[PDB]
Amino acid sequence: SGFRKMAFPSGKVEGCMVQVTCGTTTLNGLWLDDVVYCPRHVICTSEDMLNPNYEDLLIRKSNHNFLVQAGNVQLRVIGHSMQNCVLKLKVDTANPKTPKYKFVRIQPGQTFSVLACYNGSPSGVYQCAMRPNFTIKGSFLNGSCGSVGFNIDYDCVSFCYMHHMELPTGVHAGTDLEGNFYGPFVDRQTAQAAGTDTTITVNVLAWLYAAVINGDRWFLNRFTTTLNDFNLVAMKYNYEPLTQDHVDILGPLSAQTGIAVLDMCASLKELLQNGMNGRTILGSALLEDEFTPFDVVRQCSGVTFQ
Amino acid sequence: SGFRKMAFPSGKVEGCMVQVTCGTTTLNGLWLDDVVYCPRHVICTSEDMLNPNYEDLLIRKSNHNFLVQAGNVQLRVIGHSMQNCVLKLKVDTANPKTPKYKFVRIQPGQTFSVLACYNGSPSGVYQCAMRPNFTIKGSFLNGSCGSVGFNIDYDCVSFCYMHHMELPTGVHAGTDLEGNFYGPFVDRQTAQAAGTDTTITVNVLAWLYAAVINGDRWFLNRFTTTLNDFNLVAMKYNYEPLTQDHVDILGPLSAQTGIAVLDMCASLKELLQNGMNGRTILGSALLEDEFTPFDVVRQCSGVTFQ
Ligand SMILES: *[C@H](O)[C@H](C[C@@H]1CCNC1=O)NC(=O)[C@H](CC1CCCCC1)NC(=O)OCc1cccc(Cl)c1
Ligand SMILES: *[C@H](O)[C@H](C[C@@H]1CCNC1=O)NC(=O)[C@H](CC1CCCCC1)NC(=O)OCc1cccc(Cl)c1
């Protein structure tokens, strides 16, 4: 028992991280087979940021302008292309440590592990959720661009995030690995703000089930509620609407705990209206929304990876 | 910016995890050079747990009783010995993925990453602290024994924990890698309880500095306090005494933030006496004590590993 924010084991991704230097900018790249993926703003300079035309900027580059270092072995770039907001550097050596992998674009509310990196070297690993406003609340300093977020499925690494920038509230924005930003953000230095966020309701419910699985029950009640009247309460507390699809996703946890989904909704209602009154749940004094239902099942059942 | 509970990158340790089977028990082992380290209670059986004499139990074993599997390659045991509560299985193949490493016994209040494992396969990675009562609040199911905790220093893996059991409060107990339990616990099935825990004061202060570095300042004040009068307040709220050595350890964070250590103590005093009044710090509604001063500096300055 116990319940922690648990990241995926990072080894498969550590073997893919490289340093990409172009001009006065250094950031991280992702080396899979003979291609290095990195944010296209690596080709910007300190005076290009304002409103760059990356097509122009890229046609002015030569392969030899891109300095790619994999540890203490430097990689020759033999070609380059742009895909949305990611640069693909073709190198003359395939990464022998390339895992089985997929590129996936995730939905808000889904979670992933971030391998935070500087100069191609990993600093640490932690679990994030994609917020409803398409930002992540990460831990990123200068040099971290090109760090990736990922999930692991049995043996396969699903890459879903590459880091590009920090918004003025201190939250983070980036792309999928095909270079499409999450959210309305652009890799331009302009007025950009996160926008209003909401709590991921289905995740809070998953975490309440985690708590029950682990012996916290003080928040349960005999009441129930309908999905309608729950969502009426959710809206007032800035929670995402709970859908019938969410309810079905919470099915397995409901079976295992013997607590119908709509009964856990009634418990969440009372926690929203009354607060926790100095109680904690799973070591938290706040309702936690960065565990998906699958995260809970994985951790409370012991799934592993090969 | 941002601040997360960040684990060390786990790749170096993933390449050392193996499955150890003896009799009806399966658990994890740590394969470094030609030795596999695992909890000695692997040699117990379902009727041995009550009060086993492991010396007797071990002299009755043959090498071929230990089934060691490194993925889909099975390892022959060519010898076995006992060191305190860990079994050392000598195998005829050295692990080619052995990192540079140390065994270290940590002090309460120090943190480490846990690579949670089942059947020799990693499940997830997360950050723990050794509690003052020598337990850890982990996330461990049956089969997780032999999972290890570790820190990384530049390029070197310092192993500091191997998992053995869960106490009745749902917290976890284990040994250093030389087999000495942390705390008064024994690998015997008897009445064993964690004992009273306390909050790691120097860590709370580190985390308050993390908050300032990241733009939370609402808890600061103009007051100061003496180390004596702080510890008088600490005792009443079940906090560890703050030592002059703790104060000196918090020096770097004090410089960088311009906030004298004793002024941050005055801020912690008021948080203890008044609570947070519905405020949060770094996303938490509780005072967080599982970040050491070194953790804060590492994360807020961007240290990496090779
Ligand atoms: C890439 O390593 C870097 C990561 C940022 C720095 C601080 N936190 C992060 O996550 N990204 C940038 O610095 C980014 C660069 C621009 C270049 C032109 C196209 C759009 C991206 N700019 C950025 O994030 O500005 C905000 C910021 C806040 C605080 C410190 C800094 Cl250095 C930047
Ligand atoms: C080893 O994989 C296992 C890890 C425990 C199981 C549940 N959570 C854990 O951390 N350890 C044990 O099962 C341990 C075995 C004894 C054997 C005799 C010597 C001392 C250790 N016993 C144990 O932890 O009992 C408490 C417990 C609580 C809940 C479930 C279980 Cl299966 C055990």
Same domain, A41 and A165: no
Return the amino acid letter for B155. Answer: D
Boundary-marking domain end, from B162, B197, B232: B197
Nearest CA in chain A to B5: A126
Q: Record the tokens describing residue A186, joined without a space.
A: 């652009």
Residues with C-beta less than 6 Å from any ligand 1 atom:
A 27, 41, 44, 49, 140-145, 164-166, 172, 187-189
Q: How far is the CA of A142 from the centre of ligand 1 (A)?
A: 6
| Inter-residue contact A268 to A204 (CB < 8 Å) | yes
Residue B286 forms part of a structural domain: yes
Q: How far apart are CA B281 and CA B298, in angstroms?
A: 19
Nearest residue by C-alpha to atom 26 in ligand 1: A166
DSSP A40: G
Q: Record the tokens describing residue A237, joined without a space.
A: 């507390």
Q: Mind telling me how many Å the CA of A230 is from chain B's nearest CA? A: 24
Q: What method did the depositors use to determine the structure? A: X-ray
- Annotated active-site residue A117? The verdict is no
- Annotated active-site residue A41? The verdict is yes
| Inter-residue contact B213 to B296 (CB < 8 Å) | yes
DSSP H or E segment with residue A80: strand A77-83
Instruction: Find residues 219-278 of chain A whose CB sits inside 8 Å of chain B.
Output: none
**In which residue are the tokens 């904690």 written?**
A280
Same domain, B117 and B53: no
Same domain, A79 and A125: no
Residue B239 forms part of a structural domain: yes
A276 by Cβ neighbours in 10 Å (0-12 / 13-18 / 19+) ranks as middle
Contact status of B169 with chain A (Cβ, < 8 Å):
no
What CATH number does residue A91 fall under?
Answer: 2.40.10.10
Which residues of chain A does B115 touch, with a Cβ-Cβ cutoff of 8 Å?
9
Nearest to A228, CA basis, from A241, A210, A215, A211: A241
Which residues of chain B does A10 touch, with a Cβ-Cβ cutoff of 8 Å?
9-11, 125
Domain range spanning residue B138?
Answer: 1-14+100-197
Q: Mind telling me how many Å the CA of A7 is from chain B's nearest CA? A: 5
Q: Mind telling me how many Å the CA of B212 is from chain A's nearest CA? A: 13
Contact status of A166 with chain B (Cβ, < 8 Å):
yes
Boundary-marking domain end, from A182, A197, A212: A197
Same domain, A255 and A191: no
Q: Where are the alpha helices (DSSP H) in chain A?
A: 11-14, 54-59, 201-213, 227-236, 244-249, 251-257, 261-274, 293-301
Contact status of B99 with chain A (Cβ, < 8 Å):
no
DSSP H or E segment with residue B296: helix B293-301
Return the amino acid letter for B279. Answer: R
Contact status of B144 with chain A (Cβ, < 8 Å):
yes
Strand order in the sheet with A25-32: A73-75, A67-70, A17-22, A25-32, A35-39, A86-91, A77-83
Q: How far is the CA of B60 from the centre of ligand 2 (A)?
A: 23
Atom of ligand 1 nearest to the CA of A48: 18
Q: How far apart are CA B110 and CA B130, in angstroms?
A: 6
Ligand nearest to the CA of B188: 2
Same domain, A208 and A191: no
> Do A124 and B285 lie within an 8 Å CB cutoff?
no
Sign of CA dihedral B3, B6, B8, B10: negative
Nearest to A252, CA basis, from A204, A199, A206, A202: A206
Same domain, B294 and B258: yes
Same domain, A122 and A79: no
Q: Record the tokens describing residue B71, joined without a space.
A: 């993925």
Q: List Cα–Cα distances, B289 to B198, B203, B267, in angstroms.
A: 10, 5, 15
Same domain, A206 and A292: yes
Same domain, B144 and B283: no
Same domain, A295 and A227: yes
Boundary-marking domain end, from A178, A197, A216: A197
Residue B176 forms part of a structural domain: yes
Same domain, A191 and A283: no
A71-74 contact pairs (CB < 8 A, 24+): A71/A120, A71/B306
Q: How far is the CA of A259 from the centre of ligand 2 (A)?
A: 27
Q: How far is the CA of A166 from the centre of ligand 1 (A)?
A: 5
**In which residue are the tokens 């030569």 written?**
A62
Q: Record the tokens describing residue B154, joined without a space.
A: 């530049």
Residue A306 forms part of a structural domain: no
Atom of ligand 2 nearest to the CA of B138: 10
**In which residue are the tokens 């209602």 written?**
A269
Q: How far apart are CA B126 and CA B8, in angstroms?
A: 8
Residue A21 forms part of a structural domain: yes
Residue B140 forms part of a structural domain: yes
Q: Mind telling me how many Å the CA of A50 is from chain B's nearest CA? A: 22
What CATH number does residue A225 fall under?
Answer: 1.10.1840.10
Same domain, B134 and B192: yes
Ligand nearest to the CA of B174: 2
Q: Number of folded domains in chain B?
A: 3
Q: Record the tokens describing residue B44, joined without a space.
A: 């117990």
Contact status of A75 with chain B (Cβ, < 8 Å):
no
Residue A31 forms part of a structural domain: yes
Contact status of B179 with chain A (Cβ, < 8 Å):
no
Which residues of chain B does A139 touch, with a Cβ-Cβ cutoff of 8 Å?
1-4, 6, 299
Residue B306 forms part of a structural domain: no
